[PDB]
Write a protein that binds this ligand. Structure first.
Ligand SMILES: NC(=O)C1=CN([C@@H]2O[C@H](COP(=O)(O)OP(=O)(O)OC[C@H]3O[C@@H](n4cnc5c(N)ncnc54)[C@H](OP(=O)(O)O)[C@@H]3O)[C@@H](O)[C@H]2O)C=CC1
Ligand code: SF4
Ligand code: SF4
Ligand code: SF4
Ligand code: SF4
Ligand code: FES
Ligand SMILES: [Zn+2]
Lengths: 694, 61, 49, 78, 74, 123, 77, 86, 118, 57, 77, 125, 69
């Protein structure tokens, strides 16, 4: 229950047991800080949050002192100002004059709080000099200049509590205390880059960005993170035509201040191996060509080949917008085809879970609902490589709650205790009608998280039928207040695809295609496209799909267009263009409209407003931006789509396999990254730097 | 340099931070001046005591 | 010169009497033209009507 | 009438929605043999550098320098 | 905005194999990608031709004999 | 005192649309009467009918405005432009901003449909 | 203006420098103004006499700031 | 018009106008799918939209008629008319 | 050296002027353009010009590698690139370099290297 | 007067790409780009001054 | 970033050699001004030219422009 | 409706009124810093047009632009003032609502609570 | 005047009382590179040709083809 207290004369109210700094933040009172973070545990080592309380003789730490009723706080008086001055004097005693060569310059809390709450000049002139500290090698992503460490312990707290990487610590004692791995080890985690943002000094910095830019040079665009279906909200920092870095953004219901390393460091791939001009295959060579010539060639291929009905195949890959897929589907249907297809292994056939109700392919117990969790079952998903931030959320819940977690699948090096109980469908049914089934039944907020790798199997109906039966049989998993059936997607376009109906007929499932338009589709195998078919790759990077193509149309990347992306929850988010596309590249729906007009059809929209109206005509949830909708048809969906048409399928005994064999190098932008290549050579479990011999 | 600013011992910056001791800009609408007129000032008070003067001020606010 | 001596003084302290004078002056103007003067404001020898 | 701006200038510069560089520029056209007003293209785009504004509040509240004759009276407690 | 009224497209490939990607809207600071050589640019028709070519950023090479007759082309 | 120039008009905001109607029609009359002067002063390469056509076009641009104060501002700026044109304050360079149609055709490819603009990256 | 907003006091030596150089600047302005008024009225010779004194003072400008005309010397503070 | 190839239902989740369509989707959706086994039935909700049904026949020709009625039977007859008025 | 142009023709440049510096042939940074790329993309403005007289300064990456390592008795080396022959600072900020590790260690302002007497 | 980039007596160049000159320049005459040199040093790859923008302040 | 000036506004002036030169600054608490108007002494004088030079012959207008001491950077700013 | 069309008297180009889109947003609290003073102001900024935003110059490598609103950023006191100004000037806009941190009680004592069972994780500090 | 070597350009100009002939050895700059004095070459083929020390920020894909096996 809330209490009442006074801070600088202002009366404010927060819950009991809260820290004083939280009250000061609610009251609009600014209090300094280096070691306090809203998402990390409370440490009281910087001694910069000191304020005066009438109760206490000495000044007390706002970060740690509990809030009490009737307490009177002052953050204004001479003792507090002198305290801040003294603490900054000691802090900058042994700090190095690296401000020109430091990459935190211009965005340093130490600089700003020295200017605001500290002295104008120093009194340290000792002839013996300052302390020195040797630089650590903790990997190819985080660069270390550890003379600048102020010993806040944010890195350690993050790595040991939020990430599950206990290799970072606090070795030594006193002035010779050094943060790092006591021996040369790597900071092996898919969340390591947030250490760079948490350090208020430049002791831990981005290595590929090391000296590229300063903060004031940068345009800051608030956009959305492709590379996973979490829809992490990001800030793209751009210097003209070049995207310099990507950093996280606050969204407490999606990603909560964090982003993974792919999202942060795959930006290096938007400036190499890009497609800047159209290309025509004349033989074993690609020949650069104009837009008119390439679209002319596509039209002539359509008229020479005469694909009847479902012989025109449309493939959409990861990292594609919704607008592009809608335009491609409208075109493909105007040409008489229903062979809209995903780049997954079993993408030629529609999903076993069906697309009739959105509840069947979404994370219905929303990302903030993991915090409500009491029991979790993980079917065919490693959340550390699929939606790592959601794995961090699962950990966060597990550390503060009674949370019992099980998994049916490959044995996964998890950041929590996971209770592995099988790898087959047999073991799934065993678990669901044995012990963990009753664990799920007696729970008040149980979660059954199914992976997309299950949909990428032939015997997926067997699974989804089993899980659907268990769901409709168990009230606790599906109520009028809570839905525990969740499907975790690993790529950012699948939810929007299924929302717009980007799946194939079964009439088209068995057709051999004569033309194959593949859009951002880099996971094709060279067996899903015939040797005698005319193929059209539309993308932004040449990795796999453009090698196959007969015509290549350069498109725009997610940093170069304002697209709509649907995440796992069903949350539609709108990006924002940071730059324009390079060279002769174009927005992709405009490409599809032009090539429609070159062909014997034409889409009825001509600018972005009409495309938004078409999105509304397809699904009105695609324009309710950032709103996660409930659904009224949970019972109906589990009875119609998951349990009904899947009883005919018989299970395999092939063990479940991991879906993402390398977290790094998952898509075109990452496979074109050299930083991801270095991070794939390193961060391999076979290396001695990445395994501590416990 | 000059002595009281170059001194290394008894020279806290907050005692010579004149920028942050800047004078506020006072603003007086017609409400605030009839308060000074109907009631008085802190130099020449003409206001009742307790809650009576409080809601006497509130009648002008 | 061995040591230069310069006292620490607030530049605003030089204005206080004049500030009070401007306040009184503005009060007179407001009382003479209550139909027109919405307010007045005073900062460091500057009176705004 | 206008006093500072060009004789056919369209816009009012010191408005905050008016950009620093304006909407038009001038060159000499050899074809028309005339000074021609054309849209704007800069070889070097303007760099604002106001994104480096301080994230911490620089100067607090000031100092009350009203005289006591112009502060409203606190009523005596009782 | 300005426009490239001389070009039908922005990606243009020459008959010798050079790929020319036009940069900008079509003004002074824009570039078509093209390079040209006008051998009588000092004169009557050549002046107008070079003006029309360089209005949109076509890199004109002007071979000249008299240093003083060409200055109006810069 | 500081006296006004030749064709100055004191700024007086009408409180009626019916009075501003007469003011606007008078200004139109004055522009039309002064078009020969605009052709003689500025060495214009086209008709006086063309100048009057342009005047009519610019007066039609703001024909269906109904907010009175906006119309007052437009009248004031129109009179400013009349004073700037009839008194030879402008040069030919600024006067011919109104006349981009009379200059020769700007190249061959002027898009009006989607595929043109796409090939030229204007869609 | 910026010092009045910043509420900072310039030291005494800076004040004396600003005063001395403000009056050097006044000498420069009047040497331009009077001896251009003279030239426009027809007296050509005072211009050329006074501009040498302008050069002699420009040297002091250049020695204190490094620029003959645009010193950027007197700053806020 | 060779066939129905996609049906799309739009409805609010708690609006007054969408209760008939809600009942229709809850009760008859299986029968609808069985009667049109080659179609894409897409139920898509969003708070604030008026109930409406879109049918897509062939070469991307699409028709639509709103479903603000006061009975499940009216929803069924209207949907059948749209699926017949190809 | 003869450089193939984008229009298919050759651009003959002597070897002395294809070096990035007179004391280094190669580049010393990824985003740095090679002299061949410079000529290949700007030869219209180099054509009748003298390459003898253009600016071609020496590269510091090769001059600082000629400077020998300094040795210290301790874990810290202090660097201040002062002149010692004229008044004023005239150097870079004072920097303390840790040298406990086996190899040599460079200052961040200048590239002067230090070792721990071994 | 005319601008110049200085070296140390080592021969190494003094500039470290801090971009304070680019930031304080009232005329925006300086344009800088930098990255990590091959020997691990913070040094510029681009440093341009438009004298026709500069005010020589 | 620069030094952040307190919020407020000031008109201050000096006896410039041309007359009363003033600057009306507005500060928004930021490192950059919100508004800076320069009251140039030549603006007012050239505005008064119409009142001062009426009834005079053209040779006297030259003397009037010369005694106003008009530099036009300050007039036009 | 009945909002005045100040666009007619602005003197600005009509392409701003017909073709361009602005965004009205609060600056996100940076991950690099714990400060919050850049927030609390509602920025107005123009979206990118692809052909005119940035391109490199062939002479010396500067980044050229054709967009005359690429560095302009208006700052307002509130969402409503920004919307009123945008509508008065005839600009189409998208409102990006701000995402604030979620309140949760934080105790220093929770770092040292008793574990009745197996320790979930070993805390450093 | 561009033909006047530096040092003398300052002595000629009344900047230093001592010429670079009579300056001490310690006031002279230390050079690890050979000194090359080049005057202004404007109006000649030796005029400075400016260029971009950088390469394009966005690197394009060198197309390579694969067969459908
Ligand atoms: N103008 C007309 O009425 C007609 C012109 N033409 C032809 O069209 C072209 C237009 O030229 P025009 O417009 O008449 O204006 P010019 O004829 O003045 O253009 C003449 C150009 O030729 C150059 N030139 C002449 N002789 C030589 C030479 N021996 N070596 C190098 N350069 C030389 C001149 O260079 P410099 O200036 O250095 O002498 C000048 O650039 C010419 O080919 C002309 O014959 C055809 C029919 C009618
Ligand atoms: S961490 Fe901050 S204060 Fe320390 S050197 Fe870097 S920029 Fe300067
Ligand atoms: S390394 Fe950085 S984040 Fe970690 S304690 Fe030191 S200063 Fe803080
Ligand atoms: S970037 Fe500019 S200020 Fe920084 S070291 Fe280089 S020249 Fe000096
Ligand atoms: S104008 Fe000249 S002196 Fe001033 S910052 Fe720019 S380059 Fe440096
Ligand atoms: S924030 Fe409280 S001691 Fe660091
Ligand atoms: Zn050094």
């Amino acid at each position: 229950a809330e209490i009442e207290l006074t801070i600088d004369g202002h009366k404010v109210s927060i819950e009991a047991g809260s820290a004083l700094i939280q009250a000061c933040e609610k009251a609009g009172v600014t209090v300094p800080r280096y070691c306090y973070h809203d998402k990390l545990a409370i440490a009281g080592n910087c001694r910069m949050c000191l304020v005066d309380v009438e109760r206490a003789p000495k000044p007390v730490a706002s970060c740690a002192y509990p809030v009490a009723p009737g307490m009177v706080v002052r953050t204004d008086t001479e003792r507090v100002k002198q305290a801040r001055e003294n603490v900054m004097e000691m802090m900058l005693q042994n700090h190095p004059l690296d401000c020109p060569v430091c990459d935190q310059g211009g965005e340093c809390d130490l600089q700003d709080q020295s200017m605001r709450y500290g002295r104008d000049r120093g009194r340290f002139t000792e002839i013996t000099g300052k302390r020195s500290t040797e630089d650590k090698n903790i990997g190819p992503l985080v660069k270390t200049s550890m003379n600048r460490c102020i010993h806040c312990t944010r890195c350690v707290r993050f790595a040991n509590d939020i990430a599950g990487a206990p290799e970072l610590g606090s070795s030594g004692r006193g002035n010779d205390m050094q943060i790092g791995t006591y021996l040369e080890k790597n900071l092996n985690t898919e969340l390591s880059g947030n250490v760079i943002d948490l350090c208020p000094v430049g002791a831990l910095t981005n290595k590929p960005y090391a000296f590229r830019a300063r903060p004031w040079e940068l345009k800051k665009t608030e956009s959305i993170d492709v590379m996973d279906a979490v829809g992490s909200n990001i800030r793209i920092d751009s210097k003209g035509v070049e995207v310099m870095r990507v950093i996280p953004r606050v969204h407490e219901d999606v990603n909560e201040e964090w982003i993974n390393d792919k999202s942060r460091f795959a930006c290096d791939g938007l400036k190499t191996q890009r497609l800047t001009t159209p290309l025509i295959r004349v033989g074993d060579k690609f020949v650069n060509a104009t837009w008119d010539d390439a679209l002319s060639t596509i039209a002539k291929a359509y008229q020479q080949k005469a694909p009847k009905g479902d012989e025109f195949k449309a493939v959409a890959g990861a990292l594609v917008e919704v607008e592009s897929m809608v335009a491609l589907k409208d075109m493909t249907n105007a040409l008489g085809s229903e062979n809209t297809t995903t780049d997954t292994p079993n993408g030629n056939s529609a999903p076993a879970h069906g697309i009739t109700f959105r509840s069947n392919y979404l994370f219905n117990s929303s990302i903030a609902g993991i915090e409500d969790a009491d029991a979790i079952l993980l079917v065919g998903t490693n959340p550390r490589r699929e939606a790592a931030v959601m794995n961090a959320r699962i950990r966060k819940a597990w550390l503060r709650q009674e949370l019992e977690i099980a998994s049916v699948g490959p044995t996964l090096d998890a950041t929590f205790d996971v209770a592995e109980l099988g790898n087959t469908h047999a073991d799934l049914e065993k678990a669901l009608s044995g012990e963990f089934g009753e664990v799920l039944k007696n729970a008040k907020n149980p979660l059954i998280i199914v992976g997309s790798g299950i949909t990428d199997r032939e015997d997926a109906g067997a699974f989804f039928n089993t899980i659907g039966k268990f769901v409709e049989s168990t009230p606790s998993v599906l109520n009028e207040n809570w839905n525990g059936y969740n499907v975790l997607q690993r790529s950012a376009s699948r939810a929007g695809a299924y929302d717009i109906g980007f799946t194939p007929s079964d009439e088209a499932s068995k057709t051999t295609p004569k033309m194959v338009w593949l859009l951002g589709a880099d996971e094709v195998a060279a067996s899903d496209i015939p040797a005698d078919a005319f193929v059209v790759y539309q993308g932004h990077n040449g990795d796999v799909g453009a090698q196959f193509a007969d015509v290549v149309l350069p498109g725009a990347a997610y940093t170069e267009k304002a697209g709509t992306y649907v995440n796992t929850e069903g949350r539609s988010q709108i990006s924002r263009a940071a730059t324009g596309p390079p060279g002769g590249a174009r927005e992709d729906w405009k490409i599809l409209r032009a090539v429609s007009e070159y062909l014997g059809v034409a889409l009825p929209y001509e600018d972005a407003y009409e495309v938004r109206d078409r999105l509304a005509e397809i699904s009105p949830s695609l324009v309710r931006y950032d709103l996660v909708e409930p659904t009224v048809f949970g019972d109906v969906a589990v009875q119609h789509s998951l349990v009904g048409p899947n009883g005919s399928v018989t299970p395999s005994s092939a063990p479940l396999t991991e879906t993402i064999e390398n977290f790094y190098m998952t898509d075109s932008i990452s496979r074109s990254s050299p930083t991801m290549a270095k991070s794939s050579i390193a961060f391999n479990k076979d290396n001695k730097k990445n395994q501590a011999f416990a | 340099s000059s002595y009281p600013t170059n001194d290394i011992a008894e020279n806290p910056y907050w005692k010579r931070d004149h920028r942050r001791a800047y004078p506020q800009t006072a603003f007086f609408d017609q409400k605030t001046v009839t308060g000074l007129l109907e009631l008085g000032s802190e130099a020449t008070p003409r206001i009742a005591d307790g809650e009576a003067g409080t809601k006497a001020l509130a009648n002008i606010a | 010169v061995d040591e230069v001596y310069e006292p620490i003084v607030n530049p605003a302290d030089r204005y206080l009497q004049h500030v009070s004078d401007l306040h009184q002056y503005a009060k007179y103007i407001m009382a003479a033209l209550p139909k027109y003067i919405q307010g007045f404001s005073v900062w460091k020898d500057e009176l705004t009507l | 009438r206008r006093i500072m701006t060009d004789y056919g200038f369209e816009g009012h510069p010191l408005r905050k929605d008016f950009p620093l560089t304006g909407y038009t520029e001038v060159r000499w056209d050899e074809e028309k043999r005339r000074v021609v007003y054309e849209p704007l293209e800069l070889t070097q785009a303007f760099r604002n550098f106001s994104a480096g504004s301080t994230a911490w509040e620089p100067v607090g509240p000031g100092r009350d320098d009203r005289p006591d004759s112009f502060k409203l009276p606190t009523p005596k407690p009782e | 905005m300005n426009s490239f009224e001389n070009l039908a497209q922005d990606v243009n490939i020459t008959r010798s194999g050079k790929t020319l990607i036009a940069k900008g809207t079509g003004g002074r600071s824009s570039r078509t990608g093209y390079t040209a050589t006008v051998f009588g640019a000092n004169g009557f028709l050549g002046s107008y031709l070079t003006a029309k070519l360089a209005k949109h950023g076509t890199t004109v090479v002007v071979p000249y004999r008299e240093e003083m007759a060409k200055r109006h082309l810069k | 005192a500081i006296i006004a120039t030749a064709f100055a008009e004191t700024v007086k905001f009408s409180g009626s649309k019916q009075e501003l109607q007469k003011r606007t029609l008078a200004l139109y009359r004055q522009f039309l009467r002064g078009a020969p002067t605009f052709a003689d002063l500025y060495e214009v390469q086209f008709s006086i009918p063309t100048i009057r056509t342009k005047i009519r076009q610019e007066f039609e641009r703001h024909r269906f405005v109904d907010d009175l104060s906006i119309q007052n501002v437009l009248y004031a700026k129109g009179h400013m432009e009349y004073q700037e044109c009839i008194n030879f304050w402008k040069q030919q360079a600024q006067f011919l901003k109104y006349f981009p149609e009379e200059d020769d055709i700007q190249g061959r490819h002027q898009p009006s449909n989607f595929v043109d603009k796409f090939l030229k990256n204007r869609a | 203006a910026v010092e009045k907003l910043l509420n900072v006091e310039v030291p005494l030596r800076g004040k004396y420098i600003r005063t001395m150089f403000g009056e050097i600047t006044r000498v420069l302005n009047h040497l331009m103004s009077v001896c251009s008024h003279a030239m426009d009225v027809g007296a050509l010779t005072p211009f050329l006499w006074g501009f040498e004194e302008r050069e002699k003072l420009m040297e002091f400008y250049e020695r204190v700031s490094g620029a003959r005309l645009h010193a950027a010397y007197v700053r806020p503070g | 018009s060779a066939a129905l190839r996609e049906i799309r239902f739009h409805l609010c989740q708690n609006g007054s106008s969408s209760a008939p369509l809600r009942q229709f989707v809850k009760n008859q959706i299986g029968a609808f799918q069985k009667a049109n086994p080659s179609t894409k039935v897409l139920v898509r909700e969003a708070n604030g939209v008026k109930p409406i049904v879109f049918a897509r026949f062939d070469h991307g020709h699409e028709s639509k008629i709103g479903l603000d009625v006061s009975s499940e039977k009216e929803v069924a007859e209207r949907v059948k008319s749209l699926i017949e008025a190809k | 050296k003869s450089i193939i142009s984008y229009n298919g023709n050759t651009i003959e440049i002597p070897e002395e002027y294809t070096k990035q510096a007179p004391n280094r042939d190669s580049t010393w940074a990824p985003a740095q353009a090679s002299k061949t790329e410079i000529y290949k993309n700007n030869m219209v403005r180099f054509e009748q010009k003298d390459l003898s007289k253009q600016p071609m300064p020496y590269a510091g990456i090769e001059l600082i590698a000629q400077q020998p390592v300094r040795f210290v008795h301790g874990n810290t080396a202090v660097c201040d690139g002062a002149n010692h022959n004229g008044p004023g600072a005239q150097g870079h900020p004072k920097i303390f370099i840790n040298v406990d590790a086996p190899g040599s260690h460079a200052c961040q302002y200048c590239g002067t290297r230090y070792e721990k007497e071994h | 007067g005319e601008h110049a980039l200085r070296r140390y007596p080592s021969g190494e160049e003094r500039c470290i790409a801090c971009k304070l000159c680019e930031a304080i320049c009232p005329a925006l005459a300086i344009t800088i780009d930098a990255e990590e040199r091959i020997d691990g040093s913070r040094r510029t790859t681009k440093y341009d001054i438009d004298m026709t923008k500069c005010i020589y302040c | 970033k620069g030094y952040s000036v307190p919020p407020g506004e000031t008109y201050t002036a000096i006896e410039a050699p041309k007359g009363e030169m003033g600057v009306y600054v507005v500060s928004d608490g930021s490192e950059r001004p919100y508004k800076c108007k320069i009251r140039a002494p030549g603006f007012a004088h050239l505005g008064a030219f119409d009142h001062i030079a009426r009834g005079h012959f053209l040779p006297d207008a030259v003397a009037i422009i010369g005694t106003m001491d008009l530099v036009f950077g300050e007039v036009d700013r | 409706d009945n909002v005045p069309a100040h666009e007619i008297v602005s003197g600005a180009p009509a392409e701003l009124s017909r073709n361009r889109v602005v965004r009205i947003y609060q600056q996100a609290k940076p991950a690099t810093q714990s400060g919050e003073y850049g927030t609390f102001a509602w920025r107005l900024d123009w979206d990118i047009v692809d052909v005119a935003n940035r391109w490199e110059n062939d002479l010396i490598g500067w980044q050229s632009s054709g967009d005359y609103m690429q560095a302009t950023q208006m700052k307002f006191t509130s969402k409503e003032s920004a919307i009123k100004f945008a509508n008065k000037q005839g600009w189409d806009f998208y409102i990006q609502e701000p995402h604030h941190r979620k309140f949760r009680v934080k105790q220093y004592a929770n770092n040292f609570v008793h574990s009745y069972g197996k320790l979930k994780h070993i805390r450093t500090k | 005047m561009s033909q006047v070597e530096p040092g003398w350009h300052f002595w000629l100009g009344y900047g230093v009382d001592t010429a670079p002939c009579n300056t001490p050895k310690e006031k002279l700059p230390i050079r690890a590179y050979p000194y090359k004095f080049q005057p202004n070459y404007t109006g000649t083929p030796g005029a400075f040709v400016t260029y971009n020390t950088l390469k394009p920020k966005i690197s394009a894909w060198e197309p390579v083809t694969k067969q459908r096996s």
